[PDB]
Design a protein around this ligand. Structure first.
Ligand SMILES: [Mg+2]
Ligand SMILES: [Mg+2]
Ligand SMILES: [Mg+2]
Length: 346
């Protein structure tokens, strides 16, 4: 059983001043739309999801912070409710059908299908609010991001059904999306009332720093949520388990290897994003700031939420983040799916 040390983060804390109201309003939202079973919802409303959103969009427009918080709770509604603690999470094919239908609800709330499902009803409310604060492009990107997430958790469900653990390369590829990190990105733009143009947003290097944020956020989560996951009775996947199997490591060794990986991605992210900011648009500079807010917001929330601290069986969490890495090198990760990120240096 493990000790998680303070992790390296060069980003300063920030939070929206109305974080408390937002957290209350998200709990009310979960109740209004009856998101999750009574048991699951009871947990979710106590997990400071509004506070989390307030750290992701610390200077964002309040209505969007609220939208993002409701969305993050909805996402746990599907991820906990179906994928990790539901029957559909062992049935990749059935899962795929449900998620395809939910995509259609997100595209067309008016379509007379899944009119009885609470998750669908919640999604319609979210889409309606995306229509207020987003362009057509951002809305489609939000839907495409939902599909990315949905396709990756069907793949995760294949592993859960077979009880298998993917190799590091497959895990990384999967984990870039199955943490529902890319779905947040359009709302970062909406939160500040601008649209990131395709020539920047879809530029290979800008996509890369977005993936780096996803990697750091999911790896930091793997580290912080390890306790909560390992001690649960259900199947679980994370970087530590993958590294134990792949490199024949103990949990403690797997922890250190994981920390070294996210440290190197943290450093790369900072360097490449600074390069991009120097000659990017004002919108790109704001986007890159929001990626920092997302990473650090997930860091502060990860060590504080009862979702990870689990008071009934307390996690051993650090209280602070350090401002220097354990792994200082610019040696690329030995992971084919992401090693190309280091080609972006010059
Ligand atoms: Mg999950
Ligand atoms: Mg989970
Ligand atoms: Mg986790």
């Amino acid at each position: 059983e493990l000790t998680v040390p303070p992790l390296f983060s060069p980003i300063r804390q920030a939070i929206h001043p109305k974080h408390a109201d937002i957290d209350v309003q998200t709990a009310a939202w979960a109740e209004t739309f009856r998101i999750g079973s009574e048991e699951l919802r009871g947990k979710l409303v106590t997990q400071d999801i509004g506070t989390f959103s307030a750290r992701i969009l610390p200077e964002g427009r309040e209505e969007v912070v609220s939208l993002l918080a409701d969305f993050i709770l909805w996402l746990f509604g599907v991820d906990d409710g179906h994928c990790e603690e539901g029957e559909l999470g062992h049935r990749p094919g059935d899962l795929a059908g449900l998620l395809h239908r939910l995509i259609r609800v997100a595209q067309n709330p008016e379509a007379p299908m899944m009119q009885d499902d609470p998750l669908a009803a919640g999604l319609r409310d979210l889409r309606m609010r995306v229509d207020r604060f987003g362009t057509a492009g951002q809305t489609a990107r939000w839907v495409d991001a939902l599909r990315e997430y949905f396709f990756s958790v069907v793949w995760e469900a294949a592993h859960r059904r077979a009880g298998t653990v993917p190799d590091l390369n497959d895990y990384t590829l999967m984990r870039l999306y199955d943490g529902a990190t890319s779905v947040v990105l359009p709302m970062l733009e909406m939160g500040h009332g601008y649209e990131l143009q395709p020539y920047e947003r879809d530029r290979t290097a800008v996509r890369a720093v977005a993936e780096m944020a996803s990697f750091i956020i999911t790896w930091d989560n793997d580290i912080f949520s390890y306790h909560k996951e390992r001690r649960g009775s259900g199947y679980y996947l994370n970087a530590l388990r993958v590294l134990e199997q792949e490199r024949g490591l103990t949990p403690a060794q797997a922890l250190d290897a994981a920390i070294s990986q996210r440290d190197r991605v943290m450093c790369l992210f900072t360097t490449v994003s600074e390069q991009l900011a120097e000659q990017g648009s004002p919108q790109l500079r704001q986007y890159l700031h929001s990626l920092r807010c997302f990473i650090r917001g997930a860091q502060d929330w990860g060590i504080s939420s009862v979702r990870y601290t689990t008071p009934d069986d307390p996690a051993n969490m650090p209280s602070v983040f350090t401002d220097v890495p354990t792994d200082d090198s610019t040696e690329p990760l030995d992971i084919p799916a992401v090693s190309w990120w280091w080609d972006l240096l010059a």
